[PDB]
Amino acid sequence: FGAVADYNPTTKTGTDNTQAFRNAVAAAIAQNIRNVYAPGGPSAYMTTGEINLGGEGFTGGEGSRDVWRGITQGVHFFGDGPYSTIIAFNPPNTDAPCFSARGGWGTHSPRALSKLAIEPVNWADYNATSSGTGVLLQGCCFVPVTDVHIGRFHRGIHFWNKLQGTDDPTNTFTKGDFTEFNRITRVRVFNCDIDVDYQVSLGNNSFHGNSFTDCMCQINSYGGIGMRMWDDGSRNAIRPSSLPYEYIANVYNNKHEINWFGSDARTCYLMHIDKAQGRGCNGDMTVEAAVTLRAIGQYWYQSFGSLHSISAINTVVDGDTDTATRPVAFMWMNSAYPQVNFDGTDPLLTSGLTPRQYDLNNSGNTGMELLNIRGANTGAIWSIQNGAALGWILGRRAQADSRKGTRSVWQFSYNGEVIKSVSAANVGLQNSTGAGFGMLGDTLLRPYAASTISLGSPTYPFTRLRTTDWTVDTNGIVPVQDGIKNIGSSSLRVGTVFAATGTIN
Amino acid sequence: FGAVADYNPTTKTGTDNTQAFRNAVAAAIAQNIRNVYAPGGPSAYMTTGEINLGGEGFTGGEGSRDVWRGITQGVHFFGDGPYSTIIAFNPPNTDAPCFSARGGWGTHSPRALSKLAIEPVNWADYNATSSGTGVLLQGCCFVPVTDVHIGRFHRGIHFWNKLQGTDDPTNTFTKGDFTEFNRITRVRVFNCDIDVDYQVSLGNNSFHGNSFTDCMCQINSYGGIGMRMWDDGSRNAIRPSSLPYEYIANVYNNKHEINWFGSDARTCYLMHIDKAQGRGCNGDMTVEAAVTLRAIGQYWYQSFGSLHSISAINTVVDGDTDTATRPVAFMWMNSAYPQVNFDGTDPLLTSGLTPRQYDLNNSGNTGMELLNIRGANTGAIWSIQNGAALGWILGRRAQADSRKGTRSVWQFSYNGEVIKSVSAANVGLQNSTGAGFGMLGDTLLRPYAASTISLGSPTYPFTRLRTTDWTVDTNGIVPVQDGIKNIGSSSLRVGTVFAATGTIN
Amino acid sequence: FGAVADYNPTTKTGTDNTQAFRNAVAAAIAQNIRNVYAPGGPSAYMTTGEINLGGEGFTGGEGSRDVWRGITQGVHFFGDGPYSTIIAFNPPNTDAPCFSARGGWGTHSPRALSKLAIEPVNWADYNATSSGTGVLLQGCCFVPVTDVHIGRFHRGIHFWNKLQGTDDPTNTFTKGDFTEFNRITRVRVFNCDIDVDYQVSLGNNSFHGNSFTDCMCQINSYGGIGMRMWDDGSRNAIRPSSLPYEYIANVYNNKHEINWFGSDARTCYLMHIDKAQGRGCNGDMTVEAAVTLRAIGQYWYQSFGSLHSISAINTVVDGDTDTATRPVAFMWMNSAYPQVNFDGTDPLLTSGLTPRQYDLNNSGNTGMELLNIRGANTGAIWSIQNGAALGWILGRRAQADSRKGTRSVWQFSYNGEVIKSVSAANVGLQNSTGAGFGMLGDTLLRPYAASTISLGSPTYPFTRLRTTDWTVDTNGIVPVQDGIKNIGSSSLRVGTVFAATGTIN
């Protein structure tokens, strides 16, 4: 179709292959041969315009569907290898993607992309901001993107919910654009401003089923964002609708298996949240160099995977996290990074003490551990490292604050000496029926049931009772002081005194 | 080979390409060029018969093996894309697959399939039952199925162990058909009656190593089963062998990473178990809309992954689950759905109370949480939300019933006031040597060792002893009533009384 | 390029296609068409020399990089299918690979390999040692290896850090060869001596981001190693530098999702560690038949995944594991296999008792379990199976030994009768202010604060005090023996005795 690969990096000139690519896509769609091959010629193919991958005129709504509930409009664009074929893209504006998937939502389409590189004509410096998008996905479902490279654009992968439903005059924003179920495997992004961007402007909240696996993301050192989930609030102006979770980007049930590489010099950003929620995600994440997680508002991110980093990971929150839904902003199976020191209210849990979750296997070698006992005798032991002065604590928390503000109730001590009711007085113990004994107001040792429980039996004597002014032992009943303590009283007299001698002194 | 793509959906007529496909497969096998290409012509290829992918006559047993322990019989059938090439399949009967992998077990074969769609000529209504199979896999190992679509068949993926060993006259069912180690990536199934079906009739129990990743399953609303594992009991008739786990489908060490979409109207089914066991599986599962898990008998399913759903998930069990092996029928890292309320036996754990596992990170924001203390002082705290009246309980369970029937032993109370032996009386405490003090039968406070432990010391007095009829304090030793209580007895007399006065009254 | 596929297994003769393959690779590199196609001819292609996949002369250092931070030297070598194309490799020596990736580190290269088999001309017996390498990867990043087979070589996959930096005269070994970020999907290895080998000789410690997924490894029965991570100590001779973790193979943040099949007869090896550390890995592992994990020295392996096996897994350690970093040598989310019986020091935790971690869901049906209570009343219960005589124990551990050597501090008993300070005497309890009561030296029952806490109140009497020689009850104050016990003393006299009678006896 007249496409040649003669891009010259030195002069930044070459043949514009956007028209040839569009003609190839249209011819592939028209004849139902839904695939276009781009061989690895002598140089890169210079492209200045967007490639729709579904043909010009397929920008939104329901695509043309056959009798089998499937979109007929689409092209599988593939090359020769991950770096064998090179596409040099010159974006007309900031949001122009080299490759896009726009149109039919709810069903599969033959649109796919593999084995090539989206890679810029103009390489913007890390100090400045770049323009262009690597791959755009709006209103598309089941669009595989496998074995591709993306380099130094404003956005590497852009999940978008932009268009509003054409039959929505009452502004519900419930029928329209939503992006779900996209497969991205073995994809590299190199120093983009936002490597992955979930954005909704006038579409639905749904971001469901999109999967990342075997991918690496190079976070830009100068304030780059590895992953962003945000709502621009464009539909807020049309309908205020002052409700917190109504206008959000709902990233739920998506897979995030990405190896992140950040910077140890200029505080790069790992995750950015702005009116969006990551709920019930999964996948294992890898981080190198220092990164920080930014949360704006009460919104949060929760995943069923785990992340590991040979680094220090920082966290910044620009508001009060919605504690009525999640304890902390960022959660995983192994760590929850927004760790805040205890507020100065609990006598034991004081300021300067920070809570950290279990980690489920004591990989840190310094935390508590759960163990079972096997062989003959059986039991369960949960243990702490030596030197832990606080010991084992039974505590409680409020709904307003989950981890900070934990109120200690019971303490068992490191040295195994005292069981202490830290926040309550008059502690005691009793049996199944409820009869028992305990303390009362720092002064009394009492039985719970009045005139029921006896001190000592003929089988189990006590051998002595020593009080401040009396002692009852083998020597007899004698006071501590001489001749000041009486036996009986003028109004409360004893009866008969049976003694062997029969005479005082 | 005479194959054309001219299927007409309106009239449901076209050229039958099953013979051309079979001829292409045979020619590929004969010349050892083990690949057949199906381009995306103007329409779908109409197929009426089964494609063996290993040639006609390769239905079971050991395949032809070279000097390198590998099957020589096989074809890699690939097209142009996930939806670029369309195959319209007309099943002769219910169990006829459009594509199959039958034959050699235990080693690899060049059989593979990718980039196409198994998609029906006759679209059965969701009310009625469909006929045909998308992909059949029996007695095959290492058959990759990548980037394919399957639509509205009786079965989408059918793992089968059908044929019995030809050299098995004593009916052991230990040598013969078993399916293991199959790779299924980026595969869609659309409203099939059973999306994935593990079935064994006269073969071995082995279903090992089969992996699902980056796949979505659309569960049929009208009683569709997303995943089924079942034995039809055909070998039970030949040899009764009344043993529970001998004749089962053993789905072990398989990967199940599937995004499920169900229905909120007509109770679709997620997993069905009928004389089969899922043991030591893994993978993360996604569910949307309401689904229910059905378990028939004592059989169970256990996985090392987790599943998440924005929905309510129901569970039905048609018998007593085998508690001697697993606590509940369905288990995961984050949830175990067969949650049954406590039986009305424990005084604390009463009916209307349901147990739920830890969830390992308190993602529900309402459960207990494990925490470590960091910085200077160190300790461990496991805490509960405010309002939990039952507090922290130490309980025990029987082997017959794991979670229901838990017997409470110790209670520590929410308000930090009493340590209660819920199911036992005569509670107490003692030191390392075993000497100590406690209760005895709701009436006695006793030391464990007779005539050993003394009440009070000169260093630590008690200042008073108040009984029902006596009190010993600074005022002296005086009774509660006047002139009825005696000092000594006629048979048990005191000795000498040393008093400063020397005269009564 | 003159390559033909006419290998004869019977005579082990054929045309040597190594020169044709090298010429094809060079021609592909020169014209920037970075892909070479190997169709599935009548037989296997006989190769006697190494294929560089980057051209002859590309053995290390930084590769030729364009203006876009990427290597221009490379070839994507692909065939027709996993077993459609066969390469019969005759290794000149032990370390000769059929396919290799040598050269530029830190950036991506167009080097890739897919859809073929590395498979030997000379099949060595399982008794003897084989020679050759399937795929070698040194100083290469982002080299995908998908859908390939490897058979009976000395090494299947060899990650290597061999070459030292040419500008390193002071022998720091910090600048030079390191292998990171390699993708290996759907790859089979059949009875190799070492299926996967991480080795560093004169390069950096970095082994980061390499991922294994959907792969199976057949461990050789006669002492085969499924996975090895080791340093040969070649740089130790140049610079002694007697530091433990300086010269190691750092396998960190790598994905290990491999289904292992071992042997139940001749003790095959699963993992071998020799001056290397696996830190922060992930992935789910499958094992069949008996395997053993070997650890040499203080080095360890830690992963964020889980492994399952229908077998018994053994563990051998050839030294004292570095407990200052990890508790045990091998750790996972579900198990930690180096389980050693308790040392004979704790009175409760005696020899013959072995600790095992929680497993997070009680999948073993025999261990303790964490549960939440839902519906109206709320609480938390952690429970043990019936018959566990040891009950619930609060214990502590030293840094030198994590699990063995755990010291029991508190016991709560199975029968809910005694709270025992196992390793300490003089146990007691007190309220928030610290005033309370307890034991002291097996003999005394004392209040913590002197002359503060009183025994009994007018509201809560005790009805009796029974000592060895006295009893105070409704009958009065009477001794246990007749006429030997006195009221008062010669030096410590009582005052006035108020009695109704006025006469002794």
End-to-end CA distance of chain A: 132
Do the beta carbons of residue A378 and residue C387 sit within 8 Å?
A: yes
Contact at CB, A494 and C498, closer than 8 angstroms? yes
Residue type, A414: Y
Mutate to test the interface with C, among B25, B32, B337 (most CBs of C within 10 A): B32
Experimental determination technique: cryo-EM
Cα–chain center distance at B374: 35
Mutation target for C interface from A286, A480, A491: give the one with most C CBs within 10 A: A286
Sequence-distant contacts of B292-297: CB under 8 A, at least 24 apart: B292/B267, B292/B268, B292/B316, B293/B269, B293/B329, B293/B330, B293/B337, B293/B338, B294/B269, B294/B318, B295/B319, B295/B321, B295/B329, B295/B330, B295/B338, B296/B272, B297/B273
**Which residues in chain A have their CB less than 8 angstroms from residue B484's CB?**
495
Phi, psi (rounded to 5 degrees) for C21: -65, -45
**Three-state secondary-structure class, residue A234:** helix
- In DSSP terms, C249 is beta-bridged to C276
Structural tokens at position A133 = 């998008």
DSSP output for B163-179: PBPTT-TT----SB--E
The DSSP output letter for B268 is -
In the numeric block, which tokens belong to residue C95? 């370390």
Resolution (A): 3.0
Give dist(CA A310, CA A287) in Å, integer.
7
**Is the dihedral angle over the CA atoms B149, B155, B160, B162 positive or is it negative?**
negative
Neighbours of chain A (3+ CB pairs under 8 A): B, C
Instruction: Measure the CA dihedral A453/A456/A460/A465, to 10°.
Output: 150
Nearest of A99, A98, A101 to residue A74 by alpha carbon: A101
b/e string for C209-247 if b means 16 or more Cβ within 10 A? bbbbbbbbbbbbbbebbbbbbbbeeebeeeeeeeeeeeb
Q: Does B378 touch chain A (CB under 8 A)?
A: yes
Whether C467 and A463 lie within 8 Å, measured CB to CB? yes
CB B303 within 8 A of CB B331: yes
Q: Are A380 and A373 in contact (CB under 8 A)?
A: yes
Q: Are strands C225-231 and C194-200 parallel, antiparallel or unpaired?
A: parallel
Phi, psi of A220 (to 5 degrees): -65, 135
* 8 A C-beta contact, residue C87 and residue C44: yes
Q: How far is CA B74 from CA B30, B56, B71, B108, C148, in A?
A: 10, 11, 8, 10, 16
Name every residue whose Cβ is closer than 8 Å to that of residue B57 and which is 6 or more positions away in sequence.
none
Tokens of C264: 């139940």
Residue C37's alpha-carbon distances to B215, C78, C182, C260, in angstroms, are 30, 6, 22, 31
**Closest Cα in chain B, distance from residue A130 (Å):** 32
Structure tokens at A18: 């956007």
Q: Using an 8 Å Cβ cutoff, are A163 and A177 in contact?
A: yes
The strand pair at C183-192 and B313-317 is best described as unpaired
Residue of B nearest to C125 (CA): B68
B39 Cβ under 8 Å from any chain A Cβ: yes
- B278: phi > 0 → left, psi -120 to 50 → alpha, else beta; which? beta
Question: Given CA atoms A432, A438, A440, A444 in this order, what sign does their dihedral have?
Answer: positive
A389 touches chain B (CB under 8 A): yes
- State how far the alpha carbon of B263 is from the alpha carbons of A214, B153, B180, B225, B269, in Å: 32, 18, 31, 11, 9
Residue whose C-alpha is closest to residue A371's, from A358, A362, A380, A363: A380
- Token look-up 């996949």 returns C53
Strands C301-303 and A183-192 turn out to be: unpaired
Tokens of C427: 């146990």
Mutation target to probe the B interface, by most B beta carbons within 10 A, among A360, A469, A503 is A469
Cβ contacts of C368 on chain A, cutoff 8 Å = 370, 372, 380
Chain B within 8 Å of C11 (Cβ-Cβ)? no
Q: What is the Cα–Cα distance from C419 to C409, expressed in whole angstroms?
A: 11
Quick one: tokens of B163?
């044929």
Q: Residue A454 and residue B469: Cα distance in Å, rounded?
A: 12
C80 dihedral zone (left: phi>0; alpha: psi -120 to 50; beta):
alpha
Q: Tell whether C485 is within 8 A of chain A (Cβ).
A: yes
Q: Is A372 on the interface with B (CB under 8 A)?
A: no
Q: How far apart are the C-alpha atoms of A357 and A327, rounded to whole Å?
A: 12
Distance from the Cα of residue B157 to its chain's centroid? 21
Q: Are C47 and C85 in contact (CB under 8 A)?
A: no
C418/A contact by beta carbon, under 8 A: no
Which chains does chain B touch, 3 or more C-beta pairs < 8 A?
A, C
Whether the Cβ atoms of residue A431 and residue B421 lie closer than 8 Å to each other: yes
C: neighbours with 3+ CB pairs under 8 Å? A, B
- Residue C395 CA to residue C406 CA, distance in Å, equals 6
- Of the candidates B361, B382, B474, the beta carbon closest to that of A333 is on B361
The residues in B 156-185 lying below 8 A from A, measured between CB atoms, are none
**Nearest C-alpha in C relative to A502:** C504
Q: Which residues pair with A188 in a beta bridge?
A: A149, A216
C456 contacts in chain B (CB < 8 Å): 464-467, 471
Q: Does C483 touch chain A (CB under 8 A)?
A: yes
d(CA B304, CA B271) in angstroms, rounded, equals 16
CB within 8 Å: B361 and A409: no
Interface of A with C in 347-366 (CB under 8 A): 347, 360-363, 365
Contact status, residue B456 vs residue A466, Cβ threshold 8 Å: yes
A115: left (phi over 0), alpha (psi -120 to 50) or beta: left
**Residue A20 carries which DSSP code?**
H
Put simply, the answer to whether B214 touches A211 (Cβ < 8 Å) is yes
CB–CB of C219/C246 below 8 Å?
Answer: no
Nearest CA-CA distance, residue B86 and chain C, Å: 21
- Give the DSSP H or E segment for B30: helix B18-30
CB pairs under 8 A between B and C: 429
* Secondary structure, 3-state, A385-427: ECCCCCEEEEEEECCCCCCCCCEEEEECCCCCCEEEECCCCCC
Q: Does C385 touch chain A (CB under 8 A)?
A: yes
User: CA-to-CA distance for A486 and A157, rounded, in angstroms?
Assistant: 94
Spatial CB neighbours of A65, under 8 Å, sequence gap ≥ 6: A71, A72, A104, A107
Contact B19, B4 (CB under 8 A): no
* DSSP three-state, residue B26: helix
Are the beta carbons of B436 and C439 separated by less than 8 Å? yes
Dig out the tokens for C187 from the structure: 């790859």
Q: How far is A210 from chain B (nearest CA, A)?
A: 9
Please tell me which of the candidates A395, A429, A482 has its beta carbon nearest to residue B381.
A395
DSSP A63: P
| Residue where the block lists tokens 């309220």 | C431
What is the dihedral sign for C-alpha B217, B219, B220, B224? positive
Q: Which residues pair with A149 in a beta bridge?
A: A117, A188
Quick one: closest CA in B to C259, which residue? B209
Q: How far apart are CA A115 and CA A136, in angstroms?
A: 17
Torsion-angle region of residue C432: left (phi > 0), alpha (psi -120 to 50) or beta?
Answer: alpha
Contact C375 B356 (CB under 8 A): no
Cα–Cα distance for residue pair B97/C95, rounded to 1 Å: 46
Say whether C82 and B436 touch across the interface (CB within 8 A): no
Nearest to residue C422, comparing CAs of C487, C347, C482, C338?
C347
Cα–Cα distance measured from residue C179 to residue C137, given in angstroms and rounded to the nearest whole number:
7
From the centroid of its chain, how far is CA B304? 8
Tokens linked to C50: 């190494």
- Mind telling me how many Å the CA of B328 is from chain C's nearest CA? 9
Tokens matching residue C261: 């099949």
For residue A387, which residues of chain B lie inside 8 Å, CB to CB? 378
Q: Are A458 and C466 in contact (CB under 8 A)?
A: yes
- Give the closest residue to C339 by CA, choosing from C293, C281, C380, C385: C293
**3-state SS, residue A29:** helix
Tokens of A23: 């003609």
- Give the Å distances, CA to CA, from C448 to A83, B290, B452: 77, 60, 20
Check A374 against C356: CB less than 8 A apart. yes
Q: Name the residue among A68, A366, A497 with its Cβ closest to that of B497.
A: A497
Check CB contact under 8 Å for A483 and B461: no
Helix (H, G, I), strand (E, B) or coil at A232: coil
Return the structure tokens found at B135.
């992909």
Distance, in Å, from the CA atom of B9 to the CA atom of C294, rounded to the nearest integer, reads 62
CB-count exposure of residue B166 (10 Å: 0-12, 13-18, 19+): exposed
Do the bridges between strand B476-479 and strand B470-473 make them parallel or antiparallel, or are there none, so unpaired?
Answer: antiparallel
Show the tokens assigned to A35. 């695939």
DSSP state of B428: E
Continuous segment of H or E residues that includes residue C192: strand C183-192
Distance CA(C456)–CA(A440), nearest Å, equals 10
* Closest by CA position to C32, among listed C72, C60, C63, C1: C72
Q: Which residue has the tokens 């039985």?
A: A447
Q: Any CB–CB contact under 8 A between B485 and chain A?
A: yes
| Tokens 């002492």 -> residue | C223
Reduced to 3 states, what is the DSSP secondary structure of residue C367?
coil
Integer angstrom CA distances of residue B390 from A26, A435, A436, B342, C379: 69, 19, 19, 14, 5
Comparing CA positions, the residue from A98, A112, A111, A104 lying closest to residue A58 is A104
**Which among A303, B359, A381, A370 has a CA at the least distance from the CA of C374?**
B359
Q: CA–CA distance from B118 to each of B7, B90, B447 (Å)? A: 14, 10, 80
How far is CA A483 from its chain centroid? 76
Cβ contacts (< 8 Å) between B39 and chain A: which residues? 33
Do β-strands B407-411 and B391-397 pair in parallel, antiparallel, or remain unpaired? antiparallel
Separation CA A72–CA A70 (nearest Å): 6
Give the integer Cα–Cα distance in Å for A38 and A79. 5
Q: Does residue B308 sit at the A interface (CB-CB below 8 Å)?
A: yes
User: What single-letter amino acid sits at A350?
Assistant: T
Q: How far is C168 from chain A (nearest CA, A)?
A: 25
B456, C446 contact by CB (below 8 A): yes
**B414 to chain C: nearest residue by CA?**
C379
Amino acid at the residue B233: G
State whether B369 and A385 contact (CB < 8 Å). no
Query: Distance between CA C117 and CA C7 in Å, rounded?
Result: 14
Separation of alpha carbons C267 and C316, rounded Å: 12
Task: Note whether B4 and B15 are within 8 A (CB).
Answer: yes
Q: How distant is the Cα of A263 from the closest Cα of chain C, in angstroms?
A: 15
For residue B340, CA distances in Å to A283, A379, B404, C374 come to 31, 25, 6, 11
Residue B80 has, within 13 A of its CA and on its CB side, a CA count of 24
CA atoms of B297 and C3, how far apart (whole Å): 61
DSSP helix/strand/coil, B21 = helix
What are C462's two structure tokens? 């005790």
Question: Does A392 contact B385 at a Cβ distance shorter than 8 Å?
Answer: no
What's the rounded Cα separation, in Å, for the pair A329 and A337? 8
Size of the A and B interface in Cβ pairs below 8 Å: 429
CA dihedral C18, C20, C24, C26 (to 10 degrees): 70
* DSSP one-letter string for A157-222: EEEEE-PBPTT-TT----SB--EE--EEEEEEEEEESEEEEEEESSS-SEEES-EEEEEEEEE-TT
Which chain C residues touch A362 with a CB distance below 8 Å? 327, 402
User: How far apart are the C-alpha atoms of C372 and C378, rounded to whole Å?
Assistant: 7
- Contact of B89 with B132, CB cutoff 8 Å: yes
**Beta strands A155-161; A194-200: pairing state:** parallel
The answer to whether the CB of A108 falls within 8 A of the CB of A73 is no
Residue among A366, A377, A473 with most chain C CBs within 10 A, to mutate: A377
Which residue among B67, B253, B398 sits closest to C259, beta carbon to beta carbon?
A: B253
Whole-angstrom CA distances from C293 to B166, B316, C374 are 39, 41, 42
Structure tokens that stand for B324 in this block: 């001697």
